[PDB]
Amino acid sequence: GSSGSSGTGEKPYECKECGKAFSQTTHLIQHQRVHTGEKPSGPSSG
Ligand SMILES: [Zn+2]
C-alpha cells in the first residue's frame, strides 16, 4: 500500500524538479542545466 519504488515501465531516471523521465542517465544530468541556468527576477545569490 503506497510502496512505489516500482519501475514497472517508466525509466528509473526522472527529474525531481519538474517531472521528466529520460532513457539515459546522461540526459537527466544535462536537463538539469535548464534548472541551473536561469535569470530569476531579483538575483541575490546562487
Ligand atoms: Zn526538470
Any key phrases for this structure?
Double Stranded RNA Binding Domain, 0% strand, binds zinc ion, 46 residues, 1 helix, mainly alpha, elongated
Topology record:
Elements: H1 25-35
Zinc ion (ZN) is lined by residues 15, 17-18, 20, 31, 35.
Family: Belongs to the krueppel C2H2-type zinc-finger protein family.
Zinc finger (C2H2-type): 13-35
Protein name: Zinc finger protein 28 homolog
Task: Walk me through the structure.
It is classed as transcription. Keywords: zf-C2H2, Structural Genomics, nppsfa, National Project on Protein Structural and Functional Analyses, RIKEN Structural Genomics/Proteomics Initiative, rsgi, transcription. It forms a monomeric assembly. It contains one helix and no strands. By secondary structure, the protein is an all-alpha fold. Bound molecules: zinc ion (ZN). Residues 15, 17-18, 20, 31, 35 line the site of zinc ion.
Query: Residue share in helices?
Result: 10-25%
So how many helices? 1
**CATH-defined superfamily:** Classic Zinc Finger
Bound molecules: zinc ion
What is the CA-based Rg, rounded? 14 Å
Q: How far is the first residue's CA from the last residue's CA?
A: 40 Å
Number of strands: 0
SSE arrangement, N to C: H
Major beta sheet summary: none
Question: In the CATH hierarchy, what is the class?
Answer: Alpha Beta
Oligomer: monomer
Structural class: mainly alpha
